[PDB]
């Protein structure tokens, strides 16, 4: 049977294809992760239906009742067979779903305007004039919430106390905030790279604060777990992942 | 106690130096040894380190398809884990399981500074400067299977001059760079260790591919997910980075 693939809108990984005429079904979507899905489909021989995650979330655990949401929850509940998205492979998620080998490596960094003295997270941490934040309840925010590093704990103290204002619903909103107020956005380096190639007044500040990968998510115990990993390694070795990144970035 | 297979390779695994005799696991040190200890602290297992009997990483004999090295030790359940700079590859993942990568790297070129050589293409288009790789490892396999004209040219050169340009270990290749006119195709992580200690050497060109090192387990291992979880925990805590800083 066809697989149900959950994903999320996020440039340039997954986007609505533009056209004068209305598109339907899988035709509606394009991007790095859609090319990835197409390549995986060819290797493994499955057909699929792409469905945007119903609640529009990546997947985090509620801090009161411990329940999962987002693409992670859709996999736990067997509402999707695969998640193919810029979904960070994390310790807490791997406890509830399985990730393939990573198809992209990245890390947290800072998006901000050019031509300022700010050169690092420490530079942000030690002031309050320039506000900073991250996507609410994503892997980036979780990094700061969990960190025992003085600088990062101080940044978490700042962000959490200003959660209503500095934590945003999406990368888009974070970028929109950088462009409209004195605001620096903590976000994933791969996505920063796409943003900065299209906004020449924006730049990455400093280097990578951590390291992680994006991987394809499957429900724990899926008969596809190892098949997907093997296919990802095939695409990696074929140089296809590199071509895909060059195409979309 | 879990049996852990590994392989000598600076600075991942090496014999510890001491004025006094050493015994058991205490004979070994290195990044992978520290990693193994960290995995044990998280997962709570005890273990015995054993160097891979045949001293090989793991490849398939092209004649009979037989595996060797640490890969074979896992397939045959002669070890419970492999903790080493073992590349996560397509052919290996079909017969054993790898964790999430604890390190990311790529093939590159180890050679001298100040030369006319600035890329793999520069090596491929000549024959005065010899070049090669570790026999039967992931790097050699990259070249063997490549459809890129530059890399297939390099494979033709290496496979014909096997006895002369392919080496048995990274240490042998590095000494070859240091003592003859030779460029060594090898993994960028290990190159960085070498260039920090040999100021006349440098990496040439960028990474030619991308891959990770992972902990290997036999398929069906009850430890597979717990190992990946622990690796991800060490990643997030910054502990893998600290270990890399320690050994490099
Ligand atoms: N890619 C992230 C969301 C964005 C972010 O946290 O920076 C995740 O998987 O949670
Ligand atoms: N680490 C490699 C061996 C060295 C190399 O091929 O450059 C492997 O896993 O096969
Ligand atoms: Na899992
Ligand atoms: Na496998």
Residue numbers in the entry:
A (entry chain A): 431 to 544, 555, 566, 667 to 799
B (entry chain B): 432 to 544, 555, 566, 667 to 799
What does the paper say about this structure?
Consistent with this, we found that the K531A mutation results in slowly desensitizing responses with significant steady-state currents when either Glu or KA were applied to outside-out patches pulled from HEK cells expressing the mutant. In these mutants, both the R775 and D776 side chains adopt different conformations from GluK2 WT. In the GluK2 K531A and K531A-T779G LBD structures, in contrast, opposing R775 side chains adopt an anti-parallel interaction across the dimer twofold, whereas D776 forms an inter-protomer contact with the neighbouring sodium ion. The D776–sodium contact maintains this geometry, although with a slightly longer contact distance of 2.6–2.8 Å in K531A:Glu and 2.9–3.3 Å in K531A-T779G:Glu and :KA (unrestrained during refinement). Anomalous difference-Fourier electron density maps showed no peaks consistent with chloride binding for either K531A:Glu or K531A-T779G:Glu (data not shown). From the structural data, it therefore appears that truncation of K531, and the resulting loss of two positive charges from the dimer interface, disrupts chloride binding. For K531A:Glu and K531A:KA complexes, there were interface shifts of 5.1° and 6.8° compared with their WT counterparts. In K531A:Glu, in contrast, a 4.2° movement of D2 was required to match the WT:Glu conformation. When ranked by this sideways shift, Glu bound to K531A groups with partial agonists, whereas KA groups with full agonists. Despite its location away from the binding pocket, truncation of K531 affects the conformation of D2 relative to D1.
